[PDB]
Design an enzyme around this catalytic site. Structure first.
Site, PDB file in Angstrom:
ATOM      1  N   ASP A 116       0.845  -1.210   0.000  1.00 29.34           N
ATOM      2  CA  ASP A 116       0.000   0.000   0.000  1.00 29.34           C
ATOM      3  C   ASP A 116       0.876   1.255   0.000  1.00 29.34           C
ATOM      4  OD1 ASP A 116      -2.093   1.902   0.236  1.00 29.34           O
ATOM      5  OD2 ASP A 116      -2.287   1.608   2.377  1.00 29.34           O
ATOM      6  N   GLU A 146       4.202  -7.609   7.367  1.00 26.45           N
ATOM      7  CA  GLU A 146       2.929  -8.266   7.044  1.00 26.45           C
ATOM      8  C   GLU A 146       3.032  -9.394   6.026  1.00 26.45           C
ATOM      9  OE1 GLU A 146       0.171  -5.272   5.861  1.00 26.45           O
ATOM     10  OE2 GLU A 146      -0.241  -4.880   8.009  1.00 26.45           O
ATOM     11  N   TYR A 195      -6.170  -2.623  13.293  1.00 23.48           N
ATOM     12  CA  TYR A 195      -7.055  -1.540  12.876  1.00 23.48           C
ATOM     13  C   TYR A 195      -8.467  -1.781  13.380  1.00 23.48           C
ATOM     14  CZ  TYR A 195      -3.335  -0.011   9.859  1.00 23.48           C
ATOM     15  OH  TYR A 195      -2.129   0.421   9.385  1.00 23.48           O
ATOM     16  N   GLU A 216       1.571  -0.444  13.799  1.00 19.25           N
ATOM     17  CA  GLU A 216       0.766   0.309  12.847  1.00 19.25           C
ATOM     18  C   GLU A 216      -0.608   0.390  13.475  1.00 19.25           C
ATOM     19  OE1 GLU A 216       0.156  -0.893   8.740  1.00 19.25           O
ATOM     20  OE2 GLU A 216       2.250  -1.394   8.325  1.00 19.25           O
ATOM     21  N   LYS A 259      -4.207   8.388   6.205  1.00 21.87           N
ATOM     22  CA  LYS A 259      -4.058   8.146   7.643  1.00 21.87           C
ATOM     23  C   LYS A 259      -2.923   8.962   8.288  1.00 21.87           C
ATOM     24  CE  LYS A 259      -5.696   3.333   7.180  1.00 21.87           C
ATOM     25  NZ  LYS A 259      -5.020   2.096   6.679  1.00 21.87           N
ATOM     26  N   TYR A 272     -10.798  -1.061   9.766  1.00 23.37           N
ATOM     27  CA  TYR A 272     -11.055  -2.079   8.747  1.00 23.37           C
ATOM     28  C   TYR A 272     -12.137  -3.051   9.191  1.00 23.37           C
ATOM     29  CZ  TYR A 272      -7.320  -0.223   6.020  1.00 23.37           C
ATOM     30  OH  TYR A 272      -6.534   0.628   5.257  1.00 23.37           O
TER      31      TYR A 272
END
Lengths: 597, 595, 596
Positions: free
Chosen positions: B179, B411, B468, B503, B567, B472
């Site tokens: 991303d 990730e 998140y 994160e 963000k 999410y």
């Protein structure tokens, strides 16, 4: 169901203002209607309740029942009339008492209802009007809501994770709507209180013809001779007839046409005993001929917005000022039509389009009939009888507007995963709507981006309406390939010998975001999107209409897909034009209402 | 070794406006010796994507690009060894000098050198050509996505034939499985430097806290090697005569982030005609139990996840922006930075060295996954290139006192194939403790996943998870986000490990306010951190928190990204949003030591 | 009196979409009895200026517009006195019925009436035409500028030949002497109501904390008159058999802003066949030294300045936006509102009565000033119309408990002609105290000026000042702005009156952020309030603060107004700027009662 009027026989009393208001729960008997509301708070009627008290977020996010209350008085000299309490809408399910006695129950958030309250409101007395209003959407409502296990439309989940799943079960309940717009609720439309004679006119139907002959039918309770008269725009009587059924003929009739035509409106003036009622109407034909759609024999091209009832503070509540402003920007845009996604609009909207010459596609609130490939809603969702009552409610309510030219049964149902079931459900309603409309207007069903070859129902409507987000939700950012893919599907539609309209398409755009290279969400991307796809529309003569999504920016559910509401508007929520609107304006500056073919 | 200038070495930047031409997929499209045809100017160092807007050709390019420029060695600059150095070239490079292949390199965020002493003689003008490939895929770090796979966070209408025909016929284009935007080019400064013909090659400094400082310099010549330790003022406070051993620093000054003083000595090292200075700081890091002791004092990480992203410059180096962003960290009361999702320019670590900023250093290994359908550890030709890249980074950044933790990658798919992933990441966690003379702690940043099936995230020296809740999943309901978070926290407490949130954030469009704290508004961002941070502080084993992200940054087009990722706590031009002011206030009440 | 509905009176709404044509500077152009030619639909009530964007003719019109619709009173609604009522028309009206004139009004924010029973019989339909003139000049309130003066905050290059020639050939526009857009049209609800042919005329209720309530009911008939105080639940607690006199309430519950409870009683009055209900609130207001007392308690105003301003509605009335604001006013921990710069709709004041919000009621008397060159007190024919509109205001709001303070007007030139200024304002100070039964404090809001030469504003019952230190002067430097504020505060300490800051703010565009809080960014708004508010608290005679403004509002185009005025703590669509969350915390910790 006639819209209330004020003449020598009838009083029109607005009960709008600022009532007392109290949140409730899921318990439908939680307050005693006969007794005052506890800890009420002021609330403005008509409007949603949601954006009206920001002291906490309890009003905005409420789940269940809310409670309205106000006192109503009939002066003692308003003697011996027949008194009716009428609600333009209550969203979604309503219950209505007077002095504690139940006088109404309605389902359906977007069509009006009444109660004949003459026996409980004498001259001189004062009553306690209590209204309970349930906002809950689910598999039985229209628009459809989803139930435990599914999410809201455009939802985002991390499905399998224990921490999330335990949370979802521990989470507070909230409507999870199978539609992309915020679930505004409350008394949205003007609450009228009106009088008619003891023996009254109760329904007027008018079916006109382009030569000047008009069929009419005035339904009554008493025994008086009915006499009718047709009036011109100035108020002069130009024909007359003296029966309840029959035909009346207007010499040199003025036809009703959107600009550059004249949206010429006539009035039918029905007297009968002491009673009087003025039905408005316009004289204009519509025929689908092959792959054309003819208005007074001229081939039509729809240059239209998809709209919403949505505004700052008013939410989904009615606003005549917004209505006038909005229609004038449609005239500013060089547009000529509007789609009423995804619910019938307030009555006054269609009077304005009548007056202002704007074609309308009247749509039922049947959005969200779909559950994915493992859930057949036609078998598992109890909707068909609510669908039929509300389909009827709409046609009965707007049967007399010239501005309506196209009926839409509903929006984006699952037509691909269970084809024959979908045909067996939607075709009974296509027939119904043809039995129900005295003018026989064309019917449609607006369809999802879907596998159009598995779909067997869309192509069988009178005018095909498709929703295609080529280059936004798929092949994102690339109008070269977006245009390629659209044209493939357009070749398939060429084979079906129906007239076709693009009935939603658009690109979320944040006012302010510019980019030299026209990337997603920037204003310049919205100009590319329409300009690129529009130039392929013009290569096909059987494409007869385009409806952009959307007129303006509206609110929505929270979720990572929706930047505080939907943002595909060509205007911002305060009706300010983005770059893409100036492009559309110029395009519709050069496409004529009639004779584009 | 980072190029220096002294009495022995000359430094010389070739940065400037070079000639440039767009390529294709032929790594042999132009003659690397004849001048580029139809060239156009381009600023080096920088990404090339945002430098030419006449068309969208450069922003959206797929394939190779070509740089060219003449280099000239003044005749009076002779008798030296001559080194061509690139700080980075994203992603794959191929350099030639008067037509001659002098270097090849794979990996866009680590540096590489060519010795050119015999191809450029004093007095000569030679022609430098560089070929740069932007393509990402199953062999790249970061990972791309080959045919039949969406770009990360992308959107499709899977099966509709019209969409399916359009895909097969569409113009090709990288599909990042990460991303952020696939900025490419010569990002870090090119440099022509000289050494003595017999020169110093490598310096390793393992400093301990009593004062003793182990060392080792690697010389090519034969001369004896002498080193002196210079304190902050440049004073010799000890010395030694031997290429390897131990010097004791009398009364050491420990390196510390604010409040502490960030004290840096220098290792003055000479061999023969040659000099080199290695900055180094003296501090300890120990993971004892569920704590992270820095100089024996228990540490807390008021951190930022950053990126390398800025207007025009792209992923390019901006020294100015560096100084800015670092004084904004200090304004925020922050102390740590995670280098998402690649090693940064070296100058950044030299600034964090001097300014007192803890650094988690991270490889480009992001996007190692492809859903439960695809096993990347059986399918993707990565393992080799992943151990090289990790070597390059640790070897490059070993002497920085600012680096206190390495991260293997960001990730991967650790849940759908639980043991296959342990079999790939654990050797790397092993390799990481080997190449580092200072045995710094190792981690791996885990995405949101079924933490009960993942067997390998909990096996790191510090645990580092990306969550998140409220964004999410459980969108918009912080009541439910904290409940779900605390549920995963209940699992992480039973693991008796130090745990950092590496994160978490919420897209925030500067501008949008709501009284009701609704997703994308400046006020929901506050509610996010304020409600999640509260639940953290109840966990005595939870030692760090790195907010994603420091600032908005570009991404590939997609209906989930409002012109890039939003963000950031700052806008792209480094103006702070409302949740920044909230964070800065919270971190003014949280001490870096002893929390 | 405000229209009602009971067993005695009917209240019909003539709101809705009317027919509307643009006129010109001809009071004579269209025939009031024939239908309008080339009419267009327009929404009433609302301003007309933002309703047809097909063109800028409506937004930017100079002169008269024309409104029309047909009015039918049903046959069965018989034998009553029928009155037609305009909540407002801005600024001047002529109203015809079936061609016959029936009302004229100058004044854009106060209601007017025409008794009409003699011309609207039961069963028939009259043509009702309203002509509305939007022009403001030296004889209007608010004040308009005339030839050779610019609009307030307007810019010019004076003296350039091409410029001075274009200023003359340019199409005529209004040049407001105020900082808010010249919205015009029928802004307030238009009512048609009934009374028995001999009816209650007027109600006047003066309550005192001890329970006693002096009252008076004017009537036209000769019946005897009953009164009955009704409580919050509607039970009858006192009674009298006389049209004047006083009645006593047992354990009277008083009216108080939060944390108090805003208890409200009704006087139910019958006379003959007629009924009327007049809400009222029992609470005492006393300026006592440098304190302002509400039921004996020291009070500190945490107010907004507001405007009647919104998307589409213009200055039109919006019952929904009203309930949302008052709820944002609670959410803010605020307790006061200033009706800048005109009386609001009656329903706003009805709301504040219920919700418990202190109000300050301001005439449309803004812009009485033309700089140093011109003496408005000798050259502007304003005096009589001021007294007219002062009275219209005070008659209409006399029974509202929320109104605690009269404002005679706003920002007048009080320093170029010091003595003329007093002779013009001090009679109006006296008139307000005469015309008001409850004798509430009266003030005059002073623009930032030389306070050593102002002989007028230090003589009001409460001193209200508009200062913009750190914005319009000493710009971007709050260190210096507190210095200047502090030297002026040392001067107000010597005057021994209570002092409020009635305007102060800083233009702030939503989403402009800067670390260092530079002008127009949210962070500088925070600094501007936090810094100035710190000095307010050091001084015991500073009893209130009113921020400008509650929300961004429109304004006429000039190079100093970024698409309106942006000093709003909220945006136009009522989203809170970073400056708002600060004030919400500050007011969190400051009690309504007993701060000083």
């Amino acid at each position: 169901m006639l819209y209330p009027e004020q003449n020598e026989a009838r009083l029109k009393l607005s009960l709008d203002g600022t009532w007392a208001f109290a949140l409730g729960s899921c318990a439908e008997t939680q307050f005693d209607p006969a007794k005052p509301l506890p800890d009420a708070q002021p609330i403005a009627v008509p409007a949603s309740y949601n954006d009206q008290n920001d002291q906490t977020t309890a009003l905005r996010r409420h789940y269940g029942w809310v409670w309205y209350q106000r006192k109503v008085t009939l002066p003692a000299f308003c003697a011996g009339q027949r008194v009716v309490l009428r609600f333009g809408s209550v969203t979604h399910t309503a219950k209505v008492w007077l002095n504690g006695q139940l006088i109404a129950q309605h389902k359906g958030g977007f069509t009006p209802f009444e109660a004949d309250v003459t026996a409980l409101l004498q001259p001189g007395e004062t009553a306690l009007l209590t209204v309970a209003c349930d906002n809950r959407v689910n598999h039985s409502t229209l628009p459809v809501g989803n139930e435990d296990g599914q999410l809201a439309f455009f939802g985002s989940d991390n499905a399998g994770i224990p921490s999330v799943e335990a949370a979802k079960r521990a989470a507070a309940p909230q409507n999870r709507p199978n539609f992309d717009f915020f679930n505004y609720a409350g008394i949205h439309r003007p609450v009228v209180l009106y009088t008619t004679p003891k023996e009254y006119i109760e329904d007027v139907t008018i079916v006109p013809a382009v030569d000047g002959t008009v069929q009419y039918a005035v339904k009554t309770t008493g025994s008086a001779p009915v006499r009718v008269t047709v009036l011109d725009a100035d108020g002069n009587a130009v024909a007359s007839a003296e029966s309840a059924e029959g035909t009346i003929t207007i010499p040199e009739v003025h036809l009703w046409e959107p600009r550059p035509g004249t949206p010429y409106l006539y009035t039918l003036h029905a007297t009968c005993g002491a009673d009087v009622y003025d039905q408005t109407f316009g004289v204009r034909s519509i025929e689908v001929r092959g792959t054309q759609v003819l208005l007074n024999g001229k081939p039509l091209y729809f240059k239209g917005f998809c709209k919403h009832e949505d505004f700052t503070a008013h939410g989904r509540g009615f606003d005549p000022v917004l209505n006038v402003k909005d229609v004038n920007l449609i005239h500013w845009a060089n547009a000529n039509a509007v789609r009423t996604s995804h619910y019938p609009y307030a009555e006054e909207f269609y009077d304005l389009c009548d007056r202002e010459g704007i074609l309308v596609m009247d749509e039922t609130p049947a959005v969200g009939i779909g559950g994915g490939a493992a859930v057949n809603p036609y078998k598992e969702y109890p909707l068909a009888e609510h669908h039929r009552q509300v389909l009827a409610e709409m046609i009965h309510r707007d049967k007399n507007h010239p501005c309506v030219v196209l009926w839409s049964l509903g929006n984006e149902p699952n037509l691909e995963h269970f084809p024959q079931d979908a045909y067996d459900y939607w075709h009974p309603l296509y027939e119904l709507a043809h039995q129900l409309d005295p003018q026989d207007r064309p019917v449609t069903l607006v369809c999802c981006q879907n596998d159009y070859t598995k779909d067997i129902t869309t192509r069988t409507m009178d005018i095909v309406c498709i929703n295609r987000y080529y280059g936004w939700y798929n092949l994102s950012g690339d109008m070269d390939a977006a245009c390629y893919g659209l044209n493939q599907e357009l070749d398939f539609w060429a084979e079906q010998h129906k007239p076709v309209m693009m009935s939603e398409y658009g690109a979320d755009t944040v006012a302010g975001l510019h980019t030299a290279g026209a990337e997603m969400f920037s204003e310049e991307f919205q100009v590319e999107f329409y300009r690129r796809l529009d130039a392929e529309f013009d290569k096909r003569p059987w494409f007869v209409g385009e409806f952009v999504w959307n007129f303006a920016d509206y609110d929505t559910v929270q979720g990572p897909m929706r930047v505080d509401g939907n943002k595909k508007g060509l205007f911002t929520r305060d009706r300010r034009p983005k770059l893409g609107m100036h492009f559309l304006r110029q395009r519709w500056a050069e496409i004529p209402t009639f004779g584009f073919k």
